[PDB]
C-alpha cells in the first residue's frame, strides 16, 4: 500500500536547466526559473561553511 | 558535491580515499579532474539514491 | 631502455595477452627482450595512500622512481616491540646498536623491573641503529630518491610508494597488519629520471579505463609535458626492429561528410565516432575508400547504423561539441558520402557494466524516436553458434503495456483537448501548444503537463505494475518503454539503464507515416515522455549493445571447431517425478571443455524458487508448457559463471499446479 | 509541413558552440591552486613546409606525335614535380611531418577544382540555409581566423636525423639528409629537386640543368663533441620560406627563454638562503634548452590578471591560506606545550571559601584543542596578501553585550582580544582595541567622542574604517586623569607600543621576474618587527615586542585591579589572587614571541617564491591614518573615448579585497603556548624540513603559463584591431576585402573563437584570456592601482611586451596581400557578360580590350535609387539611374553586390533574359571572394551558362556561393578550335597559383602556357645570389637554406642534483 | 652502467652493498658524454640504420626498362 | 560589524561597467521602429508634451 | 508581443550571471551583497512584457 506510491512533481525542473554531468551528477544553472535554486543555494552554503569548520 | 568542492581539493575521510570522474560541465570541452573523499562518499550516494531501494 | 605503457601491466599475464600490439604495435617479430614489469601492487599501495596525503604530492613523489633500478623495503616494528624482539634469538642483532645494549641485552636473564634497562630503554633511539629510517609521516617526495640511493630502505609505516615490502621478523611480534633485466621493457608509472625513457602516447585520455592510472596521467601531461618523449606505434615498432572474455579492443575512426552531389567532390563537415570496437570493423571489412551510408529508398544501409548503434556518438573536430545526425532526407543537411580516413586510439575495455551483478530482468528506456523497428529486426537476424542471443520472442515494446487499456491509453490522451474552452480539438490544440516553429511554447506544454500528469500517473502506473508482474511471472525479458519513472513508480523489479541512441529523434516522429493521431500528435507526447522523465544520465546504448553483440564474436572464433556435444551447457530449476526427469530451462551457457569441466562441480544447488507448472501446449515443435516460476530466495550472481565464458542474457524458459523444487547443473 | 521541418531542423543547428553557462568560482579555486603549464617544445623531423603542388588534369601520355620512349614516365623515373598537364599548388600545413605532438590544428585545403567554402562559412556563418553559402560580410573574420590557425599550426622546431652520402654521381657526392617515416623512396625524389638526371627536352629537365651543383644538401655543422651528435646543421632542401622565418622568429623567442644551470644553482641556492645548498656541473656541456626564463613585465601581467580574477570571493582564497597553513605546520619547529596552562596557574594561591575563580574562569574560558594552531598559521600567512584578504576577528569572540569591568570573566575576555588582536592585518586594529576597553566601562566615565551614532556603547566591530576613528583616541589630551586615568593610560599605551612594520628580502631577480606590484622588487612587508639569531641553539628571553606588549597589557590590568576607588568589590582574596594570576601570567614561559620575532619570517622568506600564487602586498601603517589604504582596484578597459589609461584608471575601476572573520581565542592560545623542541639546532632542523620542497618543477612551470598568457592576449588585441577601429596603433593589411560593421556581440564572439583555438592549440584546458571575455573586448587595456585615506592614489600601469605569435600573425597578413591567389581568393571583381569566340586566354586572366571601370566612358552606375519600369505597348523596359536618369536594358553597367543580394529574385527574372542573348554586361564590385574551377578540353563545345545561373539563382541576402570559372587545358600537339561560350570573366591577374603547364611536355603550343616559376627558386637558379636571401614580402620562393636542432630538453632534477 | 657496474662487486664482496660505487658520489657529472649506438661517425641518429638509408637513397632513383 | 565596503564597491563596479547593450539599443534604434508601427494602428498615438 | 517579434535585441540573464558569480559566501553570515542583490533581483527569463 504504502510503498507503491510517487509524489505529484506538477512543475519539474526543464531538462535544459542541468550541466554537463560530473561523475553522476549534472549541475543547476543558476539562471534558472525553477524553484529550486534557492534549495541549491542553501545546501550549497551550508555544505561549505560546514566543512569550513575543524570541529 | 559542489558546497564542499571549494574547500575541498584533497581531503581525505576516514575510510575512503580519493578517485577521479570526467565532466561534461565545460560543455565546449571535456576534462577529468580528481575527486575529494568528501565528494567520493556523494558519489557513492548518488547511485543508491538515484537508483532506488530493494526491500525483503 | 624503458618505456610507459597506459594499462595496469604484470610480469605473469601480460605476455598472455600481448599488450603490445593489444595497443597496436607491430611487434610481430619475436624480438623477445621486453620484460614486463608487475605494475599490480602499486595501485594497491596508491589507494591505500590517499588515506593521508593529497593526491598530488603522492604522483609527484612517483614519478621520480626509476623503475630500472631495483630497491626493496624491510617493515620495521615499533620501538616499544624491538628490544623485546632482540630479547629472544640475540644472534640477529646489527653491530650499530650499542656495546652498552648488547651488553645489557645478550644475558639470559627477564630484566622486566632494572633501572638500568629502563634508562637503556627510555635512551633507545631507532633511527641510530638503522640509517634510512624513511619516518613516520615522511613528506614522501624523499622517499622516492631514498629508495633510488639504496638497494633496501627501511621503514615502520606500512603505507609506501615502492617494490616490496618485507618483514623484519616473525608475525607474532606486530601490529595489525634479484629481478631478471632485458634491454627493453614496458610498464605503467613512467619516470622522468631516467636519460632514456619514452612515454607511450597515441591513446587518449578520456578513454583511459581505469582511474588511478587516468589521474596520474592528467596529472602527468599537465606538468612537465615539455620534457616527456611521446612516441608514436611506429616509433615503438621501430625501436622493436585461458582467454578472457569482455575485454575487446576498440578504436576510434576518423571520418567526415562530403558529397558528390554536383559531379564534384565537396568536403562540409569533419567527423569522430568513439569507442567503436575493432572485432566489428575487422568483421564488416571497412577500409578508407568512399561509402554511401543510405541507400535509395530513403532508409539506411543498415551496416552503417549498426556502426554507429555498436558505438557511441560523434564529436565535430572544430568544436569539439556534441552532434546528432538527421535520419531524415530533409535538405537541412543529410549524409550520403563518407570516407573513413583512419584510426587514433587502440585501447582495450571491459564490456560488463558495474550495476550488471545478478541474473534478473533489464529494462532500458529510450527517446521517443529510437530505432526500435529496425533494432528488432536486427536482433531477429542474429545467427553466431546455432543460437539466436536476442530473439524477437522475449523482447517487449514501449507500448505492448500501453496497447492493453481497454480505453486504449492513446485514445484517453487523446481526451486532453477540452481541460482548456479554447482549444476544444485535437488540431487545434497541436497548432497551440507549439510555436509554428516546430518548438513549443513553454506555458502551454506546462499546462498541457498539469493536465496529463494525473493521467500519467493514476492508471499508468498500477496497471503497468499489473502487466510488470504478469511478465515477472513468466521468463526474464528486456522490457523497453519512455519516460522512466514509469518504470520507477510501477515497482519494476530488475536492472534499469538509461540509454539514448547517437541521433536525433524528433525529425524521426516528424517522418514516420500512419502512427495513430496526428504527426504533431507524437511530437507533443514525445516532449510530455521527456518532460515525465529525471534528468539523469543519457549513457549511451552502445555500453549495452557491446555486451550484446561482442563477446559472441571471440566465442565464435574460440569454439569454431569443437563439437557442440562437448561445448553446449544448460542451467535450471529442476523437478524430480511425474504426474499428470522434468526440468525448466532456465540460461544457456556455450563455453570451453577446460571451463565446463569446472563448472560441472559448483555448488548450483544452493537456490531455491516457487515454480508453477500448468496444461497447455507451445506452438513450438517439442513439447514445452509455458511454465511460471517465482524465486523465493536470492539472486544468481554473474560472477558464478565466469570471465571466461558468454551466457545468454534474458530467455524465456518452458518445460498440475505448483511445485517448490530446487535446481542443479545439466551436465555434457 | 516540410518548410517547417527544414526550419525546425535549423533552429536545432540553433545551439551554440561555446557559452560559459556555469558558475565558475570552484574552477577558479581550482585554477588559482593548480594550472596547465602549456607545450611549449615540439619536434619536427620532416620537412617543414605548408605548400604542395598537386597535379589537377593528367597529361596525355597515348598519343601519334609524340612517341611513348620519350617522356619518363614511361621509364618511371620517381620526378619530384607532377607530369601533368596542369599543376597547381595548394596550401596544406604539415603533410611532410613526422610530427612529436599535434596542434590539432592543420589547414586544409582542396584544389580548387572542388569546393573550399566551409573554411569561409566557418566562423560566423551560423545562419546559412544552404550548405554552399556564405555572407560577404564575414569574409574578412574568417581569412583572419584562418592565417591565425595557419601560422599557430606550424608553431614546432626542425629536429635533424640521418646524414649519409650518396654512391650515385648525381651530385658532388653530397650527403643527403634523411628522415623516418615508413618509407623514405619518393622523400628524396621530392626533397631534392636537383639531385635527378637530364634526359629529355621537356620544361622540368630544361628547368633542373639550368641550377647549381654544389647547393644540395649539407654544408655546414656544428660539432662539439667527438662520437656525439653534431648540434646545428644547414641543409639546402625544400622548404616554405614562410613558414622557414615563422619557426625562425619562435627559435628566436624560445632562445632567448634559454638559461644556465650554474645560475639556476646559483638562483635556487640564495632563494634557499642557504640552508639548502644545490650542485651544478662545471664541464663541457653537449647542449641544453632550459625555457624557464622571461621578463618583470610578464609577472606583473600576470599576476594583475589573477588578482583580478579572485575578486570579492574569499572562497578561491581561503584554500590557499589552508594549503600555507599545513605546509608551515610541515615546516615549522613549534607544537603545543600542552600542559603550561594547567602547570602554571596550579600555583596560584586562594581560599576555597570564594565563590568565584579566576583561574578556573579563563583556564576553562580558553581551550587549546590543537585546532587553533590551523588558525594560527593561516593568521601568519595573511601577512602575505594583506592587500586582498583583510583578516578580522568575528562578533561571537566579542563580549556581546558590552561586558563589565567587574564581571571577571569578560575582563578575561578583553584579555584575550589585546593579545590577539595586534596579529591581524586590519588597519584599524589600534581602536579595536581602544573601543573594546571603553565598551567595558560605560557609567564609570565617558569620553568627548564623535557623533551620537557611535557613541561608547556602539559595538566594537563596528568601526573597521578610517574615519570612524574617534579624535578622542586621536589626541591623548581629550582624555583627563581625573575621568578616566585608566582610558588615558590604555591609549599611550597603544600609542607607544604597539609593533612596528619591517621587511625580510625574499626573491630571486635573475630568473623570477619580481611579481609584487605596489612594493620594491624581491621584497616582502611585516606587520612586526624582526631582528634575526645569530646563535644557533636557541633560548628564552623576554626582550622583544609580542613580550613587551603582552607584558604591558598585563600592567593595566594590575592598575584596574590596583584602582580599588572604582573597584572595592571583592574580599581581598580574590583581589590578592588576580594580583598574582597576572602576574604569573606576564611571566609565563613561551617561545612563539621570540619564534614570530627571529624565526617565523625566515622561513616565511624561503616558502615565498616556491608558491603557485605569487606574493601581492600593500604597505602597512602603524597609526598614521592619512597612509591608510582605502581600496585597491584593477581595471580591463579604457571608459570613453580617451586613450591613456592614466586618465581611464580612475572612474574605470573594480575594487578587489575580502575579510577572513578568523577567531581570537585560537590566536591568543597559540601565543600563549607554545614550545620547542628540547635539543633543536636551527640548521640542522631547517636542513632536514626545507630540503624536499626545492625538488618541485611547477614553480617553474607556472611561467610559461604566464608566456602563453601576455602572447595570447596581444594576439587578440592586435586581432581585434583588425577587424574593428581601436586605440592600439595597428598596421592593417586586409582592407580590400569587405567587412562586416562589426559590434560589441560581433568582437566579442570573435575572441572567443580565437580564445577556444588558443585553448586547443599548445594543449590548455582551463581558463585562458577568459576575465578579459566579461567586458567590451574592443578597448582593451591592463591596469591597477590603490589609494590612501587623503585622495594620495598611486598606480601602476605595466608595458605589454610584443608577441612573437602577433609579430608572425602580421607576416602572415602582409604574405596573404600578394599571395592571396594561393588560398583560393581574387582581388578585384567580376564582369559577366556574353563572350563568343575561339580564343584560348584565360578567364582568371582577362585581355584588356575586355574589362571597364567607374572611368570608363558611357557607362552607369546604380545607387540607392533603382526603380524599374516595365515598358508597355512594346516599349522598352528600363531602370532609373542614381543620377536621375531613365536608362533601358542595354550597355556596360556597375553594381555593388549588396544591392543584388538585396534584391536577388527580383531582378532574376527582369534581367536573366538580357545578360543571356542581348547585348548587356554587368560589373558586381565585390573586392574579395572564392572561386572554383572547371576545366573543359577545347576541341569540343562549351557553354557555361548553367553554372552562371546556377550562382546567379543560388545568390542570397545572406549568402553567396563560390564563383564558377571555365578555362581550357593547355595541350601539345597543335589541335582543331571549336567554339565556346564564356560568360564570367574576371577584371584582375590571378595565375599567381597556376605551378606550371604541360611540365612533361617539351612545349606547350595552345591554351595558357607557363614555365617553371624561375622567380620562385632564386637560390638555384641565380649563381650571384647568396644562400640566405629571402624575397618574403613578395613571393614565397618554396626552397632555402633551413637550421635544425638537436638539443635536448632534460628535466631539471637531473640537470642539479643537490643531492644531501 | 651505474646499477651494473656496482653488481660486480656485490658479487664479489659477498654482500648485497657495495663500498666501491660509481654512484652516491658528490661530483655531479650531469654532462657525461657515454659513447653509444644512438650516434653514427658523422652526428646523425640511428633510428634507421646507416646501411639501410643508403639503399633507400641509391633505390630513390632508379630506372626499368619499358614494355 | 564588518568592513563590508570592499565587498560593496567591487559589486557595484561589476555591477556598473558591463556589456549591456540595452540603453545603446533604447537610444539610437527603438525610436526608428517605433515611428515605423505608429501609423499602422487601430489606434493612433494619442501623448501629452 | 509586435515589438518582442520584430525588436532585435533579445535578453539574456547569462550576461549578469556571468558578471557576478552569484554563490560566493564572504563573511559567513547573512549573505554577501552580490548574492543579496542576485536573489533579489532573480536573473531569469520569467517574461519581459
Not at chain 3, 602516447?201 to 596521467?217: A, M, Q, R, T, W
Not at chain 3, 569441466?597 to 508448457?625: C, F, S
Not at chain 4, 610530427?99 to 572542388?114: G, K, L, Y
Request: glycine fraction near 4%; charge should be negative; charged fraction near 20%.
Amino acid at each position: 500500500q504504502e510503498y507503491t506510491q510517487s509524489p505529484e512533481i506538477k512543475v519539474p525542473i526543464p531538462q535544459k536547466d542541468w550541466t554537463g554531468p560530473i561523475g553522476e551528477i549534472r549541475i543547476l544553472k543558476d539562471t534558472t526559473s525553477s524553484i529550486a535554486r534557492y534549495l541549491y543555494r542553501t545546501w550549497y552554503l551550508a555544505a561549505a561553511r560546514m566543512a569550513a569548520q575543524p570541529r | 558535491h559542489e558546497g564542499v568542492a571549494s574547500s575541498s581539493i584533497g581531503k581525505p575521510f576516514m575510510g575512503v580515499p580519493a578517485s577521479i570522474v570526467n565532466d561534461e560541465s565545460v560543455v565546449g570541452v571535456r576534462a577529468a579532474r580528481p575527486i575529494s573523499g568528501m565528494q567520493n562518499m556523494i558519489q557513492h550516494l548518488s547511485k543508491l539514491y538515484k537508483r532506488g531501494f530493494s526491500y525483503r | 631502455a624503458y618505456i610507459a605503457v597506459p594499462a595496469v601491466v604484470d610480469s605473469r599475464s601480460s605476455e598472455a595477452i600481448g599488450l603490445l600490439e593489444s595497443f597496436g604495435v607491430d611487434a610481430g617479430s619475436d624480438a623477445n627482450d621486453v620484460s614486463y614489469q608487475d605494475h599490480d601492487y602499486v595501485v594497491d599501495q596508491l589507494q591505500y595512500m590517499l588515506d593521508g596525503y593529497e593526491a598530488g604530492d603522492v604522483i609527484d613523489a612517483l614519478v621520480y622512481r626509476n623503475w630500472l633500478h631495483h630497491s626493496v623495503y624491510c617493515l620495521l616494528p615499533p620501538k616499544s616491540q624491538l628490544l623485546e624482539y632482540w630479547k629472544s634469538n640475540p644472534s640477529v642483532i646489527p653491530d650499530n646498536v650499542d656495546r652498552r645494549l648488547r651488553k645489557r641485552l645478550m644475558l639470559k636473564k627477564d630484566l622486566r623491573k632494572d633501572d638500568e634497562y629502563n634508562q637503556l630503554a627510555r635512551a633507545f633511539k631507532i633511527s641510530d641503529v638503522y640509517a634510512p629510517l624513511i619516518s613516520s609521516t615522511t613528506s614522501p617526495m624523499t622517499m622516492i630518491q631514498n629508495l633510488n640511493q639504496g638497494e633496501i630502505v627501511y621503514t615502520t609505516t606500512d603505507r609506501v610508494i615502492g617494490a616490496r615490502v618485507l618483514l623484519y621478523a616473525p608475525r607474532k611480534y606486530y601490529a595489525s597488519t634479484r629481478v631478471p633485466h632485458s634491454r627493453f621493457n614496458v610498464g605503467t608509472f613512467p619516470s622522468i629520471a631516467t636519460p632514456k625513457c619514452s612515454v607511450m602516447s597515441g591513446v587518449d585520455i578520456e578513454s583511459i579505463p581505469n582511474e588511478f592510472i587516468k589521474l596520474f596521467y592528467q596529472r602527468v601531461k599537465s606538468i612537465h609535458a615539455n620534457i616527456l618523449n611521446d612516441i608514436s606505434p611506429q616509433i615503438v615498432s621501430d625501436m622493436i626492429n585461458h582467454v578472457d572474455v569482455y575485454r575487446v579492443d576498440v578504436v576510434n575512426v576518423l571520418f567526415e561528410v562530403v558529397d558528390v552531389a554536383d559531379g564534384l567532390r565537396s568536403v562540409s563537415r569533419k567527423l569522430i565516432m568513439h569507442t567503436v570496437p575493432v572485432c566489428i570493423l575487422e568483421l564488416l571489412g571497412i577500409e578508407i575508400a568512399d561509402y554511401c551510408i543510405r541507400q535509395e529508398d530513403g532508409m539506411f544501409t543498415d551496416w552503417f547504423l549498426l556502426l554507429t548503434m555498436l558505438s557511441d556518438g560523434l564529436t565535430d573536430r572544430r568544436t569539439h561539441c556534441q552532434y546528432l545526425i538527421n535520419p531524415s532526407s530533409m535538405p537541412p543537411d543529410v549524409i550520403l558520402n563518407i570516407s573513413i580516413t583512419g584510426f587514433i586510439n587502440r585501447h582495450t575495455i571491459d564490456v560488463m557494466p558495474d550495476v550488471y551483478d545478478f541474473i534478473k530482468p533489464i529494462g532500458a528506456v529510450l527517446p521517443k524516436g529510437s530505432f526500435k523497428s529496425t533494432i528488432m529486426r536486427v536482433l531477429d537476424s542474429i545467427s553466431v553458434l546455432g543460437v539466436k542471443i536476442m530473439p524477437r520472442a522475449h523482447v517487449v515494446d514501449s507500448d505492448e503495456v500501453g496497447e492493453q487499456m481497454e480505453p486504449t491509453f492513446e485514445h484517453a490522451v487523446m481526451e486532453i483537448y477540452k481541460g482548456i474552452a479554447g482549444v476544444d480539438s485535437l488540431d487545434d490544440l497541436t497548432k497551440w501548444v507549439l510555436n509554428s516553429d516546430l518548438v513549443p511554447h513553454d506555458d502551454r506544454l506546462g499546462q498541457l503537463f498539469q493536465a496529463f500528469l494525473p493521467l500519467a500517473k493514476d492508471l499508468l502506473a498500477p496497471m503497468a505494475r499489473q502487466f510488470y508482474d504478469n511478465s515477472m511471472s513468466e521468463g526474464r525479458l528486456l522490457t523497453f518503454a519512455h519516460a522512466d519513472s514509469e518504470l520507477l513508480n510501477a515497482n519494476y523489479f530488475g536492472h534499469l539503464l538509461r540509454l539514448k541512441i547517437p541521433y536525433i529523434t524528433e525529425v524521426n516522429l516528424m517522418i514516420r507515416k500512419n502512427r495513430e493521431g496526428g504527426e504533431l500528435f507524437q511530437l507533443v507526447l514525445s516532449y510530455l515522455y521527456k518532460m515525465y522523465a529525471t534528468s539523469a544520465q543519457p549513457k549511451w546504448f552502445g555500453s549495452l549493445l557491446r555486451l550484446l553483440i561482442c563477446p559472441w564474436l571471440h566465442m565464435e572464433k574460440l569454439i569454431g571447431e569443437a563439437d557442440p556435444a562437448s561445448t553446449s551447457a544448460e542451467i535450471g530449476w529442476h523437478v524430480p517425478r511425474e504426474q499428470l526427469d522434468g526440468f525448466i530451462p532456465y540460461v544457456s551457457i556455450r563455453a570451453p571443455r577446460l571451463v565446463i569441466e569446472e563448472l560441472m562441480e559448483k555448488n548450483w544447488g544452493q537456490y531455491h524458487a516457487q515454480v508453477i507448472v500448468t496444461d497447455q501446449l507451445v506452438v513450438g515443435e517439442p513439447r514445452r508448457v509455458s511454465a511460471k516460476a517465482v524465486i523465493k530466495g536470492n539472486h544468481l550472481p554473474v560472477k558464478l559463471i565466469s570471465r571466461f565464458a558468454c551466457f545468454t542474457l534474458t530467455s524465456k524458459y518452458e518445460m498440475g499446479a505448483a511445485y517448490n523444487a530446487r535446481l542443479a547443473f545439466r551436465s555434457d | 509541413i516540410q518548410r517547417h521541418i527544414t526550419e525546425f531542423i535549423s533552429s536545432w543547428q540553433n545551439h551554440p558552440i561555446v557559452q560559459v553557462s556555469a558558475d565558475v568560482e570552484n574552477r577558479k579555486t581550482a585554477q588559482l591552486l593548480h594550472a596547465d603549464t602549456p607545450r611549449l617544445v615540439t619536434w619536427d623531423a620532416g620537412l617543414c613546409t605548408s605548400f604542395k603542388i598537386v597535379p589537377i588534369v593528367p597529361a596525355q601520355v597515348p598519343q601519334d606525335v609524340l612517341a611513348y620512349t620519350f617522356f619518363t614516365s614511361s621509364y618511371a623515373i620517381q620526378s619530384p614535380f607532377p607530369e601533368a598537364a596542369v599543376s597547381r599548388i595548394v596550401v596544406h600545413t604539415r603533410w611532410a611531418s613526422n610530427v612529436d605532438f599535434d596542434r590539432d590544428s592543420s589547414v586544409i585545403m582542396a584544389p580548387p577544382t572542388e569546393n573550399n567554402i566551409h573554411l569561409f562559412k566557418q566562423l560566423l556563418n551560423t545562419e546559412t540555409l544552404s550548405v554552399r553559402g556564405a555572407n560577404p560580410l564575414m569574409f574578412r573574420a574568417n581569412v583572419l581566423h584562418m592565417l591565425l590557425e595557419f601560422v599557430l599550426d606550424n608553431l614546432y622546431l626542425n629536429r635533424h636525423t640521418g646524414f649519409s652520402q650518396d654512391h650515385t654521381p648525381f651530385t658532388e657526392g653530397a650527403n643527403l639528409r634523411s628522415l623516418p617515416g615508413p618509407d623514405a623512396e619518393k622523400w628524396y625524389s621530392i626533397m631534392y629537386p636537383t639531385r635527378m638526371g637530364t634526359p629529355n627536352v621537356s620544361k622540368i629537365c630544361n628547368f633542373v640543368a639550368s641550377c647549381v651543383r654544389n647547393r644540395v644538401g649539407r654544408f655546414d655543422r656544428a660539432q662539439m663533441m667527438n662520437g656525439a651528435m653534431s648540434e646545428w646543421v644547414d641543409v639546402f632542401e625544400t622548404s616554405d620560406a614562410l613558414t622557414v622565418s615563422i619557426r625562425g622568429r619562435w627559435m628566436a623567442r624560445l632562445a632567448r627563454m634559454n638559461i644556465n644551470p650554474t645560475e639556476i644553482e646559483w638562483a635556487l641556492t640564495e632563494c634557499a638562503q642557504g640552508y639548502v645548498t644545490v650542485t651544478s656541473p662545471y664541464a663541457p656541456s653537449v647542449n641544453r634548452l632550459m625555457p624557464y626564463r622571461i621578463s618583470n613585465a610578464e609577472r606583473q601581467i600576470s599576476q594583475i590578471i589573477r588578482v583580478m580574477n579572485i575578486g570579492n570571493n574569499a572562497t578561491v582564497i581561503q584554500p590557499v591560506l589552508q594549503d600555507i597553513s599545513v605546509l608551515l605546520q610541515r615546516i615549522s619547529p613549534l607544537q603545543i606545550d600542552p600542559t603550561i596552562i594547567s602547570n602554571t596557574m596550579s600555583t596560584v594561591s586562594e581560599s576555597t571559601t570564594q565563590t568565584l575563580s579566576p583561574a578556573s574562569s579563563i583556564l576553562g574560558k580558553l581551550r587549546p584543542s590543537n585546532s587553533d594552531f590551523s588558525s594560527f598559521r593561516v593568521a601568519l600567512a595573511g601577512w602575505l596578501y594583506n592587500g586582498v584578504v583583510t583578516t578580522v576577528i568575528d562578533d561571537s569572540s566579542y563580549p556581546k553585550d558590552g561586558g563589565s569591568v567587574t564581571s571577571l570573566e569578560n575582563l578575561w575576555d578583553f584579555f584575550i582580544l589585546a593579545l590577539a588582536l595586534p596579529l591581524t592585518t586590519d588597519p584599524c586594529a589600534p581602536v579595536k582595541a581602544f573601543m573594546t576597553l571603553a565598551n567595558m566601562m560605560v557609567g564609570f566615565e565617558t569620553i568627548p567622542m564623535d557623533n551620537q551614532i557611535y557613541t561608547q556603547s556602539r559595538r566594537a566591530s563596528a568601526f573597521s574604517t578610517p574615519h570612524t576613528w574617534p579624535r578622542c583616541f586621536m589626541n591623548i589630551q581629550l582624555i583627563s586623569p581625573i575621568d578616566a586615568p585608566i582610558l588615558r593610560q590604555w591609549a599611550e599605551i597603544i600609542h607607544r607600543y604597539w609593533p612596528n612594520p619591517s621587511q625580510i628580502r625574499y626573491g630571486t631577480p635573475n630568473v623570477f621576474g619580481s611579481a609584487n606590484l605596489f612594493t620594491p622588487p624581491e621584497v616582502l612587508l611585516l606587520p612586526i618587527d624582526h631582528q634575526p639569531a645569530n646563535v644557533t641553539t636557541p633560548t628564552l628571553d623576554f626582550t622583544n615586542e609580542l613580550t613587551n606588549w603582552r607584558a604591558r597589557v598585563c600592567e593595566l590590568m594590575k592598575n584596574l585591579v590596583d584602582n580599588q576607588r572604582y573597584q572595592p568589590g571583592w574580599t581581598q582574596s580574590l583581589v590578592s589572587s588576580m594580583r598574582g594570576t597576572l602576574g604569573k601570567l606576564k611571566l609565563i614561559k613561551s617561545m612563539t614571541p621570540m619564534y614570530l620575532q627571529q624565526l617565523a619570517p625566515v622561513e616565511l622568506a624561503v616558502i615565498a617564491p616556491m608558491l603557485p600564487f605569487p606574493p601581492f602586498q600593500v604597505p602597512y601603517v602603524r597609526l598614521d591614518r592619512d597612509r591608510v589604504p582605502t581600496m585597491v582596484g584593477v581595471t580591463r578597459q579604457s571608459r570613453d573615448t580617451i586613450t591613456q589609461p592614466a586618465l581611464s584608471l580612475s572612474t574605470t575601476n573594480t575594487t578587489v579585497g575580502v575579510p577572513l572573520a578568523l577567531d581570537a581565542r585560537a590566536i591568543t592560545v597559540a601565543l600563549l603556548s607554545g614550545k620547542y623542541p628540547p635539543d633543536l639546532v636551527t640548521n640542522v632542523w631547517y636542513a632536514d624540513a626545507i630540503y624536499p620542497m626545492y625538488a618541485d618543477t611547477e614553480v617553474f612551470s607556472n611561467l610559461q603559463r604566464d608566456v602563453i598568457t601576455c602572447e595570447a592576449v596581444q594576439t587578440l588585441v592586435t586581432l581585434v584591431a583588425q577587424i574593428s577601429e581601436t586605440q592600439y596603433p595597428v598596421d592593417r593589411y586586409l582592407d580590400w576585402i569587405p567587412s562586416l560593421r562589426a559590434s560589441a556581440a560581433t568582437a566579442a564572439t570573435f575572441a572567443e573563437w580565437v580564445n577556444t583555438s588558443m585553448k586547443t592549440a599548445f594543449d590548455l584546458s582551463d581558463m585562458l584570456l577568459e576575465p578579459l571575455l566579461s567586458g567590451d573586448p574592443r578597448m582593451t587595456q591592463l591596469a591597477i592601482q590603490y589609494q590612501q585615506y587623503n585622495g594620495r592614489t598611486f598606480n601602476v600601469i605595466p608595458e605589454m611586451p610584443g608577441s612573437v605569435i602577433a609579430d608572425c600573425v602580421q607576416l602572415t597578413a602582409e604574405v596573404f596581400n600578394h599571395e592571396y591567389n594561393l588560398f583560393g581568393i581574387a582581388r578585384g571583381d567580376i564582369i559577366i557578360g556574353r563572350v563568343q569566340s575561339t580564343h584560348l586566354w584565360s578567364p582568371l586572366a582577362p585581355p584588356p580590350d575586355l574589362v571597364f571601370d567607374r572611368d570608363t566612358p558611357g557607362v552607369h552606375i546604380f545607387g540607392r535609387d533603382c526603380r524599374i519600369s516595365f515598358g508597355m505597348n512594346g516599349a522598352a523596359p528600363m531602370i532609373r539611374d542614381e543620377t536621375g536618369m531613365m536608362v533601358p536594358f542595354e550597355g556596360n553597367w556597375i553594381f555593388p553586390l549588396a544591392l543584388w543580394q538585396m534584391n536577388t529574385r527580383y531582378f532574376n527574372q527582369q534581367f536573366d533574359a538580357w545578360i543571356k542573348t542581348g547585348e548587356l554586361r554587368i560589373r558586381i564590385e565585390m573586392g574579395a571572394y572564392p572561386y572554383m574551377l572547371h576545366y573543359y578540353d577545347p576541341r569540343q563545345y562549351a557553354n557555361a551558362w548553367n553554372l552562371t545561373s546556377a550562382w546567379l539563382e543560388e545568390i542570397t541576402p545572406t549568402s553567396i556561393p563560390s564563383v564558377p570559372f571555365m578555362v581550357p587545358i593547355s595541350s601539345d600537339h597543335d589541335i582543331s578550335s571549336a567554339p565556346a561560350v564564356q560568360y564570367i570573366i574576371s577584371t584582375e591577374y590571378n595565375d599567381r597559383s597556376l605551378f606550371c603547364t604541360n611540365s612533361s611536355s617539351p612545349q606547350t603550343i595552345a591554351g595558357p602556357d607557363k614555365h617553371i616559376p624561375v622567380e620562385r627558386y632564386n637560390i638555384l637558379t641565380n649563381p650571384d645570389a647568396p644562400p640566405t636571401q629571402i624575397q618574403l614580402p613578395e613571393v614565397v620562393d618554396l626552397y632555402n637554406v633551413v637550421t635544425r636542432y638537436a638539443y635536448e630538453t632534460p628535466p631539471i632534477t637531473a640537470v642539479v642534483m643537490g643531492v644531501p | 652502467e651505474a646499477d651494473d657496474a656496482t653488481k660486480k662487486q656485490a658479487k664479489d664482496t659477498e654482500k648485497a652493498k657495495a663500498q666501491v660505487t660509481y654512484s652516491d658520489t658528490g661530483i655531479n657529472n650531469a654532462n657525461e658524454l657515454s659513447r653509444s649506438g644512438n650516434v653514427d661517425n658523422e652526428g646523425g641518429s640511428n633510428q634507421k640504420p646507416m646501411s639501410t638509408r643508403i639503399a633507400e637513397a641509391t633505390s630513390a632513383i632508379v630506372s626499368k626498362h619499358p614494355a
